[PDB]
Design a protein around this ligand. Structure first.
Ligand SMILES: *[C@@H]1O[C@H](CO)[C@@H](O[C@@H]2O[C@H](CO)[C@@H](O[C@@H]3O[C@H](CO)[C@@H](O)[C@H](O)[C@@H]3O)[C@H](O)[C@H]2NC(C)=O)[C@H](O)[C@H]1NC(C)=O
Ligand SMILES: *[C@@H]1O[C@H](CO)[C@@H](O)[C@H](O)[C@H]1NC(C)=O
Ligand SMILES: *[C@@H]1O[C@H](CO)[C@@H](O)[C@H](O)[C@H]1NC(C)=O
Lengths: 40, 48, 48, 49
């Protein structure tokens, strides 16, 4: 089967702490609203 | 393990020997301005 | 405008300008000084 | 990182005092405090001018 991965699978890209700030990064991520393989 | 500021310079670290947080401030620096009256009046000066 | 220009001026410290690093201590330890002169010259030229 | 921000010569309080001076003159004395020594005048009459 297939399913829409709404807004999910983001993770901490580094062990840095950043406080109340809109940081931006390039990394391997699950694309937003991608199409996940659902197994029964 | 360590904090960054808005400009992504290091702002804090966790001490790996004992896990408290150390804030890191720059070593202090600045201009040595000299205040003087006219040398055509005194040789006394003050340092800012 | 001033914050963007200041943060740009700071971020430009981390740019390599075709040197082997943007961190001056790396250049002062990954090379002998007679080669490191060129790498520092690139960083000086870029920062300047 | 070698960057420094220096203070203004006048503090925000002093600017608030100067703008209050400018205003207190403008209220009590018309344009006269620009042109010379401040001359008091009743505010309704400054408006009639
Ligand atoms: C690495 O971490 C350990 C675990 O913290 C350090 O050993 C000691 O562990 C205890 C429990 O975590 C710490 O808490 C308490 O400290 C007070 C100090 O007044 C003491 O009265 C208590 O009996 C209890 O020990 C303790 O602070 C912590 N540190 C020391 C120096 O005892 C360990 O020391 C660290 N590694 C190295 C190589 O030091
Ligand atoms: C996900 O893939 C299935 C099969 O290709 C398709 O039916 C569905 O429309 C796709 N969904 C999205 C969000 O593209
Ligand atoms: C400069 O100093 C001399 C004395 O050394 C004095 O005669 C002169 O008036 C001074 N000028 C000013 C502008 O202070």
């Amino acid at each position: 089967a297939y399913t829409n991965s709404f807004t999910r699978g983001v993770y901490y890209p580094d062990k840095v702490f950043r406080s109340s700030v809109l940081h931006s990064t390039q990394d391997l991520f699950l694309p937003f609203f991608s199409n996940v393989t659902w197994f029964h | 393990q360590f904090g960054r500021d808005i400009a992504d310079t290091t702002d804090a670290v966790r001490d790996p020997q004992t896990l408290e947080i150390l804030d890191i401030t720059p070593c202090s620096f600045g201009g040595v301005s000299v205040i003087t009256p006219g040398t055509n009046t005194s040789n006394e000066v003050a340092v800012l | 405008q001033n914050a963007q220009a200041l943060n740009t001026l700071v971020k430009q410290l981390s740019s390599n300008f075709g040197a082997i690093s943007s961190v001056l201590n790396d250049i002062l330890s990954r090379l002998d000084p007679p080669e490191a002169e060129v790498q520092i010259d690139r960083l000086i030229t870029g920062r300047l | 990182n070698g960057l420094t921000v220096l203070p203004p010569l006048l503090t925000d309080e002093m600017i608030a005092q100067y703008t209050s001076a400018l205003l207190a003159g403008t209220i009590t004395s018309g344009w006269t405090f620009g042109a010379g020594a401040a001359l008091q005048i009743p505010f309704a009459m400054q408006m009639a001018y």
